[PDB]
Short mmCIF file of C-alpha atoms and ligand atoms in Angstrom, two decimals:
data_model
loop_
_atom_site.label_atom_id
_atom_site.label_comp_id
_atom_site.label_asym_id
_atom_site.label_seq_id
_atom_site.Cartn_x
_atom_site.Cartn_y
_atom_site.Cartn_z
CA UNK A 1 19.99 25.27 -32.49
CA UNK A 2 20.42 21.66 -31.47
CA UNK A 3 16.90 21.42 -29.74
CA UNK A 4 16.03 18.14 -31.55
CA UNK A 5 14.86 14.83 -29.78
CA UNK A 6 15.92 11.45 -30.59
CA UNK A 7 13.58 8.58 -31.23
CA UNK A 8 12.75 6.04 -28.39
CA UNK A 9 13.25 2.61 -30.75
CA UNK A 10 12.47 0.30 -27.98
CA UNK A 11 14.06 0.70 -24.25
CA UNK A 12 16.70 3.05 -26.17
CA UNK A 13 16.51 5.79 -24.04
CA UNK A 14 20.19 4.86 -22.56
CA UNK A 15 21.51 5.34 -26.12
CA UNK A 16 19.48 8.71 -25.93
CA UNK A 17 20.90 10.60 -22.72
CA UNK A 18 24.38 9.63 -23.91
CA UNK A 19 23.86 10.82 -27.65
CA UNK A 20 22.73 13.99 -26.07
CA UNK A 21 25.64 14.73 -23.77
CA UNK A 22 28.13 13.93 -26.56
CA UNK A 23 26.00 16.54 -28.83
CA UNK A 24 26.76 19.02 -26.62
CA UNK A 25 29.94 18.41 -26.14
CA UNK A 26 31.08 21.33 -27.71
CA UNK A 27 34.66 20.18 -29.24
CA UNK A 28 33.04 16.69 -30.06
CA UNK A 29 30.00 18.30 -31.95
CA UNK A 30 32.35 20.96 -33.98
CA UNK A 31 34.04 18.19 -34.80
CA UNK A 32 31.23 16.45 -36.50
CA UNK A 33 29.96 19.70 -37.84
CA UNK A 34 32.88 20.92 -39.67
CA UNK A 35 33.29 17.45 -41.05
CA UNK A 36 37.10 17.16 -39.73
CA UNK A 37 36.52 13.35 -39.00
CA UNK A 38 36.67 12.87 -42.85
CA UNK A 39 40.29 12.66 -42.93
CA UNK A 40 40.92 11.08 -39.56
CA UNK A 41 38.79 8.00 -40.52
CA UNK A 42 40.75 4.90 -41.83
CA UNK A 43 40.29 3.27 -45.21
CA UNK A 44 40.29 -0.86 -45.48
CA UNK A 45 37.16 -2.52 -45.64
CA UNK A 46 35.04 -3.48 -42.30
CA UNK A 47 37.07 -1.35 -40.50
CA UNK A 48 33.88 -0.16 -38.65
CA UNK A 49 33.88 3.45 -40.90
CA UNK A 50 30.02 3.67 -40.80
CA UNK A 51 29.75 3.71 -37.17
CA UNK A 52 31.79 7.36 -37.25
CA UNK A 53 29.97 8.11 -40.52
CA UNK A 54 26.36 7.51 -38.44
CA UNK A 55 27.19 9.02 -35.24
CA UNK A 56 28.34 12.34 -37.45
CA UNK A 57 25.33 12.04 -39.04
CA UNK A 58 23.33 12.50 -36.34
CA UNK A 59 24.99 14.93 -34.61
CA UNK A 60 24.74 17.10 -37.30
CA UNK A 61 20.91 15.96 -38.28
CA UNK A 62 20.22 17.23 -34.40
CA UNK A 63 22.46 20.50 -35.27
CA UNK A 64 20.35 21.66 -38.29
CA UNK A 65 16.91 20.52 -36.92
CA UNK A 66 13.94 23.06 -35.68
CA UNK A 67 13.30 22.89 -32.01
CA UNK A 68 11.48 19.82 -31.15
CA UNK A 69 11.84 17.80 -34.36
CA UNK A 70 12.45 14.11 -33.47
CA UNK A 71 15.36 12.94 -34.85
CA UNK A 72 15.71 8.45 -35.80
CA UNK A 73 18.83 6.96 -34.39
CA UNK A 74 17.94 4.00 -36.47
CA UNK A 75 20.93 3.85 -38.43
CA UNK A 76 23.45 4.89 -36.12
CA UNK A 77 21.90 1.95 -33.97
CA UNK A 78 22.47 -0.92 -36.28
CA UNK A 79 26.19 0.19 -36.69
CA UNK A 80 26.82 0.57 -33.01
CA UNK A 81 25.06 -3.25 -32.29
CA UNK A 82 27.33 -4.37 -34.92
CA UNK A 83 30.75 -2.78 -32.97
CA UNK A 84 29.54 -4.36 -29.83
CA UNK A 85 26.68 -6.92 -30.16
CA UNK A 86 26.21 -6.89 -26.60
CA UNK A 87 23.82 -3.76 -27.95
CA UNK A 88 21.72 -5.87 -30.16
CA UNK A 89 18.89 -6.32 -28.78
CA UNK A 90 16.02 -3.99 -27.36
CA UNK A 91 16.38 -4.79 -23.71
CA UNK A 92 17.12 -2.04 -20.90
CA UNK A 93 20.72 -1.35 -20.65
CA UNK A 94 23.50 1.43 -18.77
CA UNK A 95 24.60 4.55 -20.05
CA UNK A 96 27.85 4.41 -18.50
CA UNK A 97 28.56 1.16 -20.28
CA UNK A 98 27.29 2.41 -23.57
CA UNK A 99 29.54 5.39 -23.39
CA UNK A 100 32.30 3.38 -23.03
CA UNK A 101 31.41 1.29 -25.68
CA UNK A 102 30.58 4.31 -27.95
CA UNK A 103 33.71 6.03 -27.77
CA UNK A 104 35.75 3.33 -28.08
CA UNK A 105 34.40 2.39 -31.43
CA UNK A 106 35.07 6.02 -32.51
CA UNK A 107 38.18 6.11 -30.72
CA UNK A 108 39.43 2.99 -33.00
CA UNK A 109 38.19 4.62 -36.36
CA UNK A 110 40.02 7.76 -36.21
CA UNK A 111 43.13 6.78 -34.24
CA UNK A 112 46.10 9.02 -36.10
CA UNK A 113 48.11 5.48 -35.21
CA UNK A 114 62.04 -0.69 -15.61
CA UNK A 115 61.94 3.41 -14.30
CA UNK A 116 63.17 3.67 -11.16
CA UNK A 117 65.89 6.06 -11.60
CA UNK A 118 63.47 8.58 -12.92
CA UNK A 119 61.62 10.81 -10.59
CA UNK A 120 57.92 10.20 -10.50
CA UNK A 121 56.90 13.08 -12.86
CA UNK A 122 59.33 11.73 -15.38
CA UNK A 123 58.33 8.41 -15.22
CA UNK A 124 54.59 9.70 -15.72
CA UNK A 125 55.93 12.00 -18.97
CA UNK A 126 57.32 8.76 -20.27
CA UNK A 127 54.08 6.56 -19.78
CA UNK A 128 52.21 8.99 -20.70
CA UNK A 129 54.08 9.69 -24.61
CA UNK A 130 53.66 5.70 -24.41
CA UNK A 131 50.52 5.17 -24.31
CA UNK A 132 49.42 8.42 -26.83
CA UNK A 133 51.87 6.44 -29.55
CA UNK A 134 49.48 3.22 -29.12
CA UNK A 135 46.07 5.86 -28.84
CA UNK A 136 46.36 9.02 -31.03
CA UNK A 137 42.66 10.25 -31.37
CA UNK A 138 40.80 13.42 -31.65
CA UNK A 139 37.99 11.46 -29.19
CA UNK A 140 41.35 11.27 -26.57
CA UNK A 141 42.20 14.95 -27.18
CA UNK A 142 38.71 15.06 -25.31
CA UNK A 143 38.25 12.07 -22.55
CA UNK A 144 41.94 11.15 -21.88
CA UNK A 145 43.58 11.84 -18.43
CA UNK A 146 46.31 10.31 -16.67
CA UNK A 147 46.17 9.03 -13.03
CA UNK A 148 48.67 8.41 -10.49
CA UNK A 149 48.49 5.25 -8.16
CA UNK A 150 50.92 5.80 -5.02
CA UNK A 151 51.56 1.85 -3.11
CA UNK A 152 53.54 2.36 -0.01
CA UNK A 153 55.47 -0.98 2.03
CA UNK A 154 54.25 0.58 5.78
CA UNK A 155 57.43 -2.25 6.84
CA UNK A 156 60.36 -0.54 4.90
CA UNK A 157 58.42 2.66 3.12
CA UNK A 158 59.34 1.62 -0.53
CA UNK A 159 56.60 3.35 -2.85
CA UNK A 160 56.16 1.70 -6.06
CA UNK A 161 54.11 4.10 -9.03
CA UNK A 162 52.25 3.41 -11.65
CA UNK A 163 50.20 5.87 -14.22
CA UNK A 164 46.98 4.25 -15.29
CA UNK A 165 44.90 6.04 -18.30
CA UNK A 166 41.50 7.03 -17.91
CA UNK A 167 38.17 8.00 -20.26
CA UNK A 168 35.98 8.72 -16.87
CA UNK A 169 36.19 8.13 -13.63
CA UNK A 170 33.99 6.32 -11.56
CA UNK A 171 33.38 7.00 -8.07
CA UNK A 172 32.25 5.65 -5.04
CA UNK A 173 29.11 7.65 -3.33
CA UNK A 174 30.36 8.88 0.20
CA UNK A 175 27.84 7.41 2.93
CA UNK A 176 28.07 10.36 5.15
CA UNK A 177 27.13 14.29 4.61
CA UNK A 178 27.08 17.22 7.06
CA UNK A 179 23.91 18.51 5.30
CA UNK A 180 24.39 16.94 1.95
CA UNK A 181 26.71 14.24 0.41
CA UNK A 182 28.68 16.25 -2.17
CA UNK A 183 30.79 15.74 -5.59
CA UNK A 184 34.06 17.05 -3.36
CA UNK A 185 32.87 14.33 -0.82
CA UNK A 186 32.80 11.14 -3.89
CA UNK A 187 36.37 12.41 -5.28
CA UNK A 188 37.74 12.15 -1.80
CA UNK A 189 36.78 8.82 -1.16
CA UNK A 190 38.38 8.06 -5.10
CA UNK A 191 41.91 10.01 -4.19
CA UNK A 192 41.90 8.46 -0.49
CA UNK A 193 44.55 6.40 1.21
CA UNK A 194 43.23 2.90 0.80
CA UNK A 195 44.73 0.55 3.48
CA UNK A 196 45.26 -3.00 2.01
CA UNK A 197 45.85 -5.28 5.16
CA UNK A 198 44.81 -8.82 6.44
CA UNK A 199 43.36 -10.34 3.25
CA UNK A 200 44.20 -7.58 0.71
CA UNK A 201 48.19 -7.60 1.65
CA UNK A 202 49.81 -6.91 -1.00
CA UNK A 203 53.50 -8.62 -1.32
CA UNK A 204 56.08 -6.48 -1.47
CA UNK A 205 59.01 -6.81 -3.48
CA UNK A 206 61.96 -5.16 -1.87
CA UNK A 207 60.61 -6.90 1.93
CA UNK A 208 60.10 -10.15 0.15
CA UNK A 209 56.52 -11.04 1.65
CA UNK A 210 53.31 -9.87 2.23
CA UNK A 211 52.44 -6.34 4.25
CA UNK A 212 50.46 -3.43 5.51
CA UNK A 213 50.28 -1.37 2.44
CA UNK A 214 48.87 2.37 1.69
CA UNK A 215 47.43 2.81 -1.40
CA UNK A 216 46.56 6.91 -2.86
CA UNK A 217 45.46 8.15 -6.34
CA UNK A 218 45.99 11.39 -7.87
CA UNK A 219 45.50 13.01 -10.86
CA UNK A 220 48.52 13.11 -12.95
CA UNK A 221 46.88 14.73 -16.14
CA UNK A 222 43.68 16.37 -16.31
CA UNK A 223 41.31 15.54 -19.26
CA UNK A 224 39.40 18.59 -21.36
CA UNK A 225 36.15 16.98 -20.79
CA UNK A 226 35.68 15.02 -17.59
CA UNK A 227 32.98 12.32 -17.04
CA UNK A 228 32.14 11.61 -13.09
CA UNK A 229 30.42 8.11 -13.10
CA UNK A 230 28.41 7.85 -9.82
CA UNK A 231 28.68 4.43 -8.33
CA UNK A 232 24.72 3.87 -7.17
CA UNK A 233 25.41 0.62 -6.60
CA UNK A 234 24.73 -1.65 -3.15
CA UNK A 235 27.34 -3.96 -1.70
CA UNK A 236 24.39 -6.56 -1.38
CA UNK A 237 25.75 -9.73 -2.15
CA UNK A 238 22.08 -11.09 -2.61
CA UNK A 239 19.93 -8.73 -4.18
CA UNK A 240 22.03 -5.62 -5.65
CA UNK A 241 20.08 -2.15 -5.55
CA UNK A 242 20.68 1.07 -6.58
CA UNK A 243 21.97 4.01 -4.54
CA UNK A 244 19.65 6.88 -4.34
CA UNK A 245 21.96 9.86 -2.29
CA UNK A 246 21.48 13.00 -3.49
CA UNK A 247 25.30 14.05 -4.70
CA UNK A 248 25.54 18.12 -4.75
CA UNK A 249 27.94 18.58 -7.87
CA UNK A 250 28.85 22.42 -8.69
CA UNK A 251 27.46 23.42 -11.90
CA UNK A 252 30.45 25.96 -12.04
CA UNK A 253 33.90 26.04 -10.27
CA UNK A 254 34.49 22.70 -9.82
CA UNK A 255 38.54 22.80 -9.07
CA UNK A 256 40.05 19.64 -8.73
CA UNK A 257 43.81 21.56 -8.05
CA UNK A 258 43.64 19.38 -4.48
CA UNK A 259 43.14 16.05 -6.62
CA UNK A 260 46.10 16.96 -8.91
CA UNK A 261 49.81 14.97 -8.51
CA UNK A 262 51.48 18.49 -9.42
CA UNK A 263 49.55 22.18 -8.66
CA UNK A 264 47.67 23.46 -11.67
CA UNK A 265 45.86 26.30 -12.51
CA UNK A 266 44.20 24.55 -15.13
CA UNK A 267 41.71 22.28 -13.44
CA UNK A 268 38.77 24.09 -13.52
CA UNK A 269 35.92 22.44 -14.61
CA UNK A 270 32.04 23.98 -15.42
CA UNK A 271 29.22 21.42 -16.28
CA UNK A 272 27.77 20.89 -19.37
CA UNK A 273 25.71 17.74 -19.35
CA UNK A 274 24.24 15.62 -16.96
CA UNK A 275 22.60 11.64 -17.61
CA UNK A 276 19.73 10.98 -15.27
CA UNK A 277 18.21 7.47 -14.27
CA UNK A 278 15.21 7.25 -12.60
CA UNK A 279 14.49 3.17 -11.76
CA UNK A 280 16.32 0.36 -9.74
CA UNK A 281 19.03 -1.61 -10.93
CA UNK A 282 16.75 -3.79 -13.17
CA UNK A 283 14.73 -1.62 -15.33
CA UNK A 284 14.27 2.31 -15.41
CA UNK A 285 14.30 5.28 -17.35
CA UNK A 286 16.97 7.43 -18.84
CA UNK A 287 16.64 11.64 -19.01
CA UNK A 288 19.26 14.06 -20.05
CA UNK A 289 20.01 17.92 -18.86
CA UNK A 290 21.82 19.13 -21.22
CA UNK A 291 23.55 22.87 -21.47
CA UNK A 292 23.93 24.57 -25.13
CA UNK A 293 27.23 25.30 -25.80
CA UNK A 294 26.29 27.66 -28.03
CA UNK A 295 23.49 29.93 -25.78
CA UNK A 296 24.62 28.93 -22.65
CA UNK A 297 21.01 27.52 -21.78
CA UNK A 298 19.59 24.46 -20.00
CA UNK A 299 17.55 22.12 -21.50
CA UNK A 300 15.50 18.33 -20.70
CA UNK A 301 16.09 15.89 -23.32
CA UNK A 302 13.12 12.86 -22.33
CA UNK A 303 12.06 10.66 -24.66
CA UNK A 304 12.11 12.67 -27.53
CA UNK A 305 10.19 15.79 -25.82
CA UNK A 306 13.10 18.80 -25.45
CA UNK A 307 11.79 21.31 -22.66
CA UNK A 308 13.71 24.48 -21.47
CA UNK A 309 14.56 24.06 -17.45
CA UNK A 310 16.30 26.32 -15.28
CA UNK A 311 19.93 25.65 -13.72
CA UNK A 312 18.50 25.71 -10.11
CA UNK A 313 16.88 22.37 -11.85
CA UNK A 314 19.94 20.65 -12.72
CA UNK A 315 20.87 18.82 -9.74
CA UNK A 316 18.51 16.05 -8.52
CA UNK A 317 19.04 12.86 -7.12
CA UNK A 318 18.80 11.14 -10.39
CA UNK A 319 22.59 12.01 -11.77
CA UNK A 320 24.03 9.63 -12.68
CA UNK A 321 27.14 10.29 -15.60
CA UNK A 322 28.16 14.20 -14.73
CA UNK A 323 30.24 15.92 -17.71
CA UNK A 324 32.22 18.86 -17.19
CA UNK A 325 34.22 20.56 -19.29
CA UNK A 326 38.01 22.76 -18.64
CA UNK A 327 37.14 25.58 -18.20
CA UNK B 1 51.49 -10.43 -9.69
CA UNK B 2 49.09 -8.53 -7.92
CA UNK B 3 46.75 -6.10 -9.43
CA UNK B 4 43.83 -3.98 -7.76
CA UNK B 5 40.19 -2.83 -7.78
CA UNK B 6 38.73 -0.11 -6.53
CA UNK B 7 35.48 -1.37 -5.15
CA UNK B 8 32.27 -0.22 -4.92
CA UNK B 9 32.38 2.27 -1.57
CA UNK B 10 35.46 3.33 -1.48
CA UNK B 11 37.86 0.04 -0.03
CA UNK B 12 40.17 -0.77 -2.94
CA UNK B 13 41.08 -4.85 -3.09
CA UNK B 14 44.09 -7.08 -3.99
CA UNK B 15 44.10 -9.79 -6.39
CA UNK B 16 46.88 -12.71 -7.35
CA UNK B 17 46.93 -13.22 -10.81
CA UNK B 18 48.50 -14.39 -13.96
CA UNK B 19 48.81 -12.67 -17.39
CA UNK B 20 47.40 -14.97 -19.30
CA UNK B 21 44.26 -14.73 -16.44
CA UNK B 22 41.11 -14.62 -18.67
CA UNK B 23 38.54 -12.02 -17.66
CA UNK B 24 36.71 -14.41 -16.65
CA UNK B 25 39.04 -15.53 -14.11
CA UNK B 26 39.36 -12.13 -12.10
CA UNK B 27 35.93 -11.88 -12.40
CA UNK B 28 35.48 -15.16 -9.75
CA UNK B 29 38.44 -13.87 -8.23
CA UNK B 30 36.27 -10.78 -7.49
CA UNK B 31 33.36 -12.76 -6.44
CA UNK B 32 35.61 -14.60 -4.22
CA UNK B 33 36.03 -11.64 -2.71
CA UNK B 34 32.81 -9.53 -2.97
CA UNK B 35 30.19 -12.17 -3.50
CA UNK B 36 29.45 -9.89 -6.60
CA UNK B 37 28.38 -12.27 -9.47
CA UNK B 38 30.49 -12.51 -12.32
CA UNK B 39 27.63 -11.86 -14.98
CA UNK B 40 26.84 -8.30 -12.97
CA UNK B 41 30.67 -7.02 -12.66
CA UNK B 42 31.54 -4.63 -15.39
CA UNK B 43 35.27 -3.88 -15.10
CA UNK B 44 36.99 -0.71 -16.45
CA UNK B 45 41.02 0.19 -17.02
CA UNK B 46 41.90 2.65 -19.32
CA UNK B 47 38.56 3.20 -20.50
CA UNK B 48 38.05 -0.10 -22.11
CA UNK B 49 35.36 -2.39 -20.48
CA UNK B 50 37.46 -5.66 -19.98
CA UNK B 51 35.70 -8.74 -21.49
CA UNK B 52 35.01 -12.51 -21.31
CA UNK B 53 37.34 -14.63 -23.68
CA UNK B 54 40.19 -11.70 -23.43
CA UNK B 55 42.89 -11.96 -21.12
CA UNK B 56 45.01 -9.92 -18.86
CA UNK B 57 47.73 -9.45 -21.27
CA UNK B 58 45.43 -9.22 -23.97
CA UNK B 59 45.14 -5.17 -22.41
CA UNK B 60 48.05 -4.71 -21.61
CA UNK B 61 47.32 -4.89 -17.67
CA UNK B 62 50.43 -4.85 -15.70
CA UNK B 63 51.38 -4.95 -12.17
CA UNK B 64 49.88 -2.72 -9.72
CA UNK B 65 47.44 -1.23 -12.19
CA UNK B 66 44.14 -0.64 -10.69
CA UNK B 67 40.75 -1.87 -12.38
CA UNK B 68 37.36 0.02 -11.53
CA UNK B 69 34.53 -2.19 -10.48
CA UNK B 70 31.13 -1.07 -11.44
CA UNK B 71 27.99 -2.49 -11.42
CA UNK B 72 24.33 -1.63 -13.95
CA UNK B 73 21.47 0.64 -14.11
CA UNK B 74 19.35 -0.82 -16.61
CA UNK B 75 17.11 1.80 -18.26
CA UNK B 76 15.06 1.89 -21.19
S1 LIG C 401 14.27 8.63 -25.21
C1 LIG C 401 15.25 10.07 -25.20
N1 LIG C 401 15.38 11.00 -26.21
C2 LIG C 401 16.24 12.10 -26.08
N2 LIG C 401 16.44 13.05 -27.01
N3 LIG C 401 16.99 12.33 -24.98
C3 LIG C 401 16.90 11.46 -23.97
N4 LIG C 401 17.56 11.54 -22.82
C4 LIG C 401 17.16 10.45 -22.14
N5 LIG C 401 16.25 9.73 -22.82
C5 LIG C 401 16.08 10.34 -23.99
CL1 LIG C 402 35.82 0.65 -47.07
CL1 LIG C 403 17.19 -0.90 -6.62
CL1 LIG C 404 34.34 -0.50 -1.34
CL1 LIG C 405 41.87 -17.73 -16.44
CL1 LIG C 406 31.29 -7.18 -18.37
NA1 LIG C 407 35.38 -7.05 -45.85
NA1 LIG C 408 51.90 1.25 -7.49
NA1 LIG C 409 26.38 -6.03 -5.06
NA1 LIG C 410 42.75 2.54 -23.59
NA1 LIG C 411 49.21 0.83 -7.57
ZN1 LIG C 412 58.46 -3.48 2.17
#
């Protein structure tokens, strides 16, 4: 069923959202379910084995609950503190960073482990097999894509490449909006051509000093699960606040094919899970919206309550972490 | 060498640095820039947060590569 709520232990409700969305992410939770971690984890003492050992315990604790049980994170909390003590206390803290925290400390307990004649696909191929022989994980089978970063000289038109890995992407909030700001809108302003001029010159090596340079990402590989970080963050170099722009994101359909460094039919993406904060920048409250992957049905995660909700619900103004999955 | 960030509304920035820059260094390097205070900047690349007392080389950061500035939502 996986209809269970989590425990609020004190401002925790950060560590809540996220632990939902990774529940239902379907691969992640069959994962813990069918136990397969078991032979992925590594053996040597303090390498951090509990903190797979307590997030798999959880996830299947939530997976064999009745509806509306509440489920303690207690223990799972003390190991995850103890990967990254910047956790250790009981103050108010971001999801985003959390996740990255989180699934880095999995990441590193069940990892399995110049170009310029090469056409740019090639030379992508080859970063690409180099990086997966440092990180070998089923938790990058899941999160791991590949972007492109395109740096043109406008003097002599030399474009230098480099392919940068990614776990999520994080993008900028477009200003603008016909009738709505939309998800399309934020992963344009991502992908765009950045000009770096007068004070962000870059030098250029083949012209030998600095000049006018275009900058463009794509996406060079696609991950299965994709995580869309909303930047709700103010330029104010004072008092920082939060963004509030309602972002439209699809809840099915979402192709990224335009995005992509090569056309693909295989970037097709429907959501699954959405983290919500409601607040400022300095103190608020974390929700999730969660989708089953087993009955295909919606449902609010808030501290510890779990509440069916329709999918005309699902987008607010609130979103914050968006996680779709290839469809 | 020179590295990037992609900012926070959509202008990307170029920094000069070192390898054996500490975190710590682009972050002021970045404030230089933004007026964004070190202690608020969280900065991703290849979906590692980048942290004080580590440096550049310490993540394998190379030329050109692009760091993603973002900032908190503190929620409880
Ligand atoms: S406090 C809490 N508990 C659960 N299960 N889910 C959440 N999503 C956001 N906050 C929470
Ligand atoms: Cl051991
Ligand atoms: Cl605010
Ligand atoms: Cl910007
Ligand atoms: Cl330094
Ligand atoms: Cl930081
Ligand atoms: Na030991
Ligand atoms: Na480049
Ligand atoms: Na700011
Ligand atoms: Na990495
Ligand atoms: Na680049
Ligand atoms: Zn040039």
């Amino acid at each position: 069923q996986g209809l269970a709520g989590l425990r609020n232990l004190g401002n925790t409700c950060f560590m809540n959202s996220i632990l939902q969305c990774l529940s239902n992410t379907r691969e992640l939770r069959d994962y813990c379910l069918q136990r397969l971690y078991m032979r992925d984890l590594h053996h040597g003492s303090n390498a951090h084995t509990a903190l797979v050992e307590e997030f798999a315990k959880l996830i299947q604790t939530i997976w064999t609950s009745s509806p509306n049980d509440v489920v303690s994170p207690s223990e799972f909390k003390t190991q995850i503190q103890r990967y990254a003590p910047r956790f250790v206390g009981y103050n108010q803290q971001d999801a985003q960073e959390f996740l990255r925290f989180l699934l880095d400390g999995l990441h590193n307990e069940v990892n399995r482990v110049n170009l310029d004649h090469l056409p740019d696909d090639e030379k992508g191929r080859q970063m690409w097999r180099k990086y997966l022989e440092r990180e070998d994980s089923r938790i990058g089978d899941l999160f791991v894509g590949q972007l492109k970063s395109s740096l043109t000289c406008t003097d002599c038109g030399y474009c230098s490449t480099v392919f940068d890995p990614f776990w999520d992407l994080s993008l900028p909030i477009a200003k603008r909006g016909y009738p709505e700001v939309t998800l399309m809108d934020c992963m344009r302003l991502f992908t765009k051509e950045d000009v770096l001029d007068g004070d962000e010159k870059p030098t250029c090596c083949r012209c030998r000093g600095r000049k006018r340079c275009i900058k463009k990402f794509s996406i060079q590989r696609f991950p299965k699960i994709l995580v869309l970080h909303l930047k709700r963050f103010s330029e104010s170099r004072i008092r920082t606040s939060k963004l509030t722009t309602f972002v439209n994101f699809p809840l099915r359909d979402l192709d990224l094919r335009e995005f992509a460094s090569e056309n693909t039919n295989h970037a097709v993406y429907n959501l699954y899970a959405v983290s919500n904060h409601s607040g400022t920048t300095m103190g608020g409250h974390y929700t999730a919206y969660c989708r089953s992957p087993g009955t295909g049905e919606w449902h609010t995660f808030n501290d510890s309550s779990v509440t069916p909700m329709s999918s005309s619900q699902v987008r607010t103004s609130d979103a914050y972490l968006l996680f779709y999955e290839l469809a | 060498m020179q590295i990037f960030v992609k900012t926070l509304t959509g202008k990307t920035i170029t920094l000069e640095v070192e390898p054996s820059d500490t975190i710590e260094n682009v972050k002021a390097k970045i404030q230089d820039k933004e007026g964004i205070p070190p202690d608020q900047q969280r900065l991703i690349f290849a979906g590692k947060q980048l942290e004080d007392g580590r440096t550049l080389s310490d993540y394998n950061i190379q030329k050109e590569s692009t760091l993603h500035l973002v900032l908190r939502l503190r929620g409880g």
